[PDB]
């Protein structure tokens, strides 16, 4: 049986990060987490491209631009959505997830999902570098593995 | 690390606004907000194109026409949906959000989401220039940032 | 500021109507409403093409055929869905709305949504020419405005 | 006014049926119903192609193959989904409906929806040839009408 | 009618920020927000003076020193007060607000109020770069507008 | 960006303390705390001036006298108010806080607020050298920082 | 400021694992997790020594033997304790944790704690490669970081 898997070393890999600015007190923790993951797994900070966008709605169109670059091996999408009083959250979360998933398939390049979709502020804090870990770190680790997998093929 | 971001100056930028007429007592406040944002950030009113459509359902097909214009840097979609008695709201909100998101990716051009999707009339009033701000102003600010980002690249 | 809008005169405009037969006691009121709107706004009955399909599920594939005709300026989709005992309603309503929205964007031609999606029979009667108006009339008015807008461009 | 409609005679029409095997005690009643409808409306049993697939998930990819055949006028999709204990039902029902709807538009050929999506076993029995009729018969009747409509054009 | 208003460009403007150290995990987010606002609206980071004081009580006397500088166009006061168990919060909040308001009138120079006065820790987190925005960003935007207004006169 | 801050060394600094005698069993702990803070941060006990007044009402007029001395760098106001049965507490607390805040601005000299305003005796004990620290120590630390800041300017 | 940290590459590192046999259906998942972590971070499976002991009580005395080996850089202790009906769990959990902590300090070598101490079977399953991750993987990652840190010094 032929087995393909990605290792977790980031030596030589080039990453794009697209990070939204809304809820920046939490998003900044996710970006720190993603960068720390890449560097301590052997990636170069110089090989990271970071794109900032205003809100999660804008992540896919920016991710589309990064994922089309030949010198980017994987894109990490980072943002924080917290449900408010209206149905707005539902529509944004659906379109951000759908757009990133569709781009990955269209461009045949890994795009990992480091977007917190929380019902409450507490849940978002828990997942941005406190008790339930750091979703930016997790999305970076997924991107390292997938970039390595795609090299193997 | 390469960082790309958009500044908030609108000098030289050209914008399209697509605004639905339904719930016009509120939509007109969102359009006022978007225009005020553009002008006080240094954009020219002469560089704004405004398209009026009957309802939110028609926003995407009109946005498609504006976003295909070479002299438009970003499109701001503006409308107000308020849940009624039937499931109708759900289907309209889903298709408007999906269509705008898909167009942005297909055309590789920022389209920002200034459509209120409210459960109640009060929630819509709150987001159309009262206690929870002005979603038209917010969508214009997002469009300025994204137009600048896309120039940087 | 450049402003584009559609007027509400239907002189010279050519329309397609796709109407489902299920719930025909109500759909026939919506079709009457759409035709009345077109004619009293100055359209010619001779410039209307009406396509009948069995149920709402079949509206998009028929609308696709009409919207591809060069001599059709706008398509009005008409039907009535009323929730039954199973989840069936949800799947049909989602696909009909998604298909019409997608066709409008693909073909760059207005397709208006005159499909009632009701939780109860009473709600459907209310929207088919009684206390909450006539959704066929409303969809025709939207189609007149959009056809005029698209001429202006 | 130009009116296009399909009659309910099946003389000369060729049909594909794609039927899932899961819940076969009920699906077999739907297939019987579809075939009976075609034959007693004047279709030839020899002009029916039946494709069996394991579950509803597999209906769209098989329907894609049949609907691409030049000698097939319409495809009838037949299956039975009954909600279980997990969210699984929701994901399968959504993808089966979305896939069939998308295929019909892409291939410009009628594909009718004879898939029961039931919350309970009783609801499925009711719609597979007992008190609420036979959804296979209904989907075949819809396919006859649409095949005739598409000839008219 | 003579209309005076401030635009939102910060080119050439010089700002003072007075920021308290108490609740620094949140105040540091407000200061980041204020600086980001100034810079992305075209201000120079070199034209910002930041004064740190121990607690909100000390903000006015420090703001008095900055607002008396001829090369400062506007002062942004930043701090976070969260109600504790005693009446202490009431007395501090009253004196900080009164002192800043009085200084602005005495010196005829804009001083904007970026001090969170929260009943709970959650409310303060919400307003320091999470779900209810960033009060430091808001106070900086107000200071840009007022500095521009005062130039116009 | 120009940053001004005060360090926490008290070498060379001269302080005034104004301490009320009412609730002296607790005020004496606050005065001990303030003096300990100054001395262990490097201040000389010989450089402290202590003024005793009968009650918190009299603190501002005495603080006015100390803060006008050229050889005083900062004044620490110390007292304990505990709510009694009447509205009296409210009026005293308001005037003491208002007077100290106003004096600091008028004289452009730091005056720090080491006055406990407690609803209960227990709350006052907690803040006078037990479980919630020592407000006299805290006010002295604030005065050291502000005296150093004002030197820097 | 001198900063010491460990990277997450395991190239060249040699590890000991001590794994208890009680609750082996879960412990075997933790051991799989630890080994997978080491290998995909670049460690050699040949550089792992695995010691099996009967129960968690016996982990420290075996860990003592491994941690005294000059060719072992870090020890990973793996086991699963689930509270039963008596106080037994408390005494075992206390002694296993105390013994491992004491050994690490005595031998000045990292020993990481991959022992689940669960109140219920469900909690243990959650932490042995299901919804709350894999504590063996986590303990191995900690051991890689600490082995690298200790090299740096």
Author numbering:
A (entry chain A), B (entry chain A), C (entry chain A), D (entry chain A), E (entry chain A), F (entry chain A), ...: 1 to 153
What does the original paper state about this entry?
In this study, we used the enzyme involved in the penultimate step of riboflavin biosynthesis as a test specimen to benchmark a recently installed microscope and determine if other protein complexes could reach a resolution of 1.5 Å or better, which so far has only been achieved for the iron carrier ferritin. Of these, AaLS from the hyper-thermophilic bacterium Aquifex aeolicus forms a 1 MDa spherical capsid of 60 identical subunits with icosahedral symmetry.
Using state-of-the-art microscope and detector hardware as well as the latest software techniques to overcome microscope and sample limitations, a 1.42 Å map of Aquifex aeolicus lumazine synthase (AaLS) was obtained from a 48 h microscope session. The final 3D reconstruction of AaLS consisted of 470 878 particles. This 1.43 Å map was slightly improved by Ewald sphere correction to 1.42 Å [Figs. 2(a), and S1(a) and S1(b) of the supporting information]. The half maps from Ewald sphere correction were subsequently used for atomic model refinement using the 1.60 Å crystal structure of AaLS as a starting model. A mask-normalized Fo − Fc-generated difference map was then used to identify peaks within 0.5 Å of hydrogen atoms in a reduced model, followed by manual curation which resulted in 552 hydrogens. Thus, we were able to identify ∼46% of all putative protein hydrogen atoms from the map of AaLS at this resolution [Figs. 2(b) and 2(c)]. About 70% of hydrogen atoms could be located in maps at 1.19 and 1.25 Å resolution compared with only ∼17% at 1.84 Å resolution. Several of the water molecules identified displayed hydrogen densities adjacent to the central oxygen atom [Fig. 2(d)]. Finally, we observed the density for a tetrahedral-shaped ligand. This was built as a phosphate ion and is consistent as a bi-product of lumazine synthesis and in proximity to Arginine 127, a highly conserved residue in this family of proteins [Fig. 2(e)]. At pH 7.5 the phosphate ion is expected to be mostly in the HPO4−2 proton­ation state, though we did not observe positive density for any hydrogens. The structure we obtained from a 48 h session at 1.42 Å is to date the only sub-1.5 Å structure of a complex other than apoferritin.
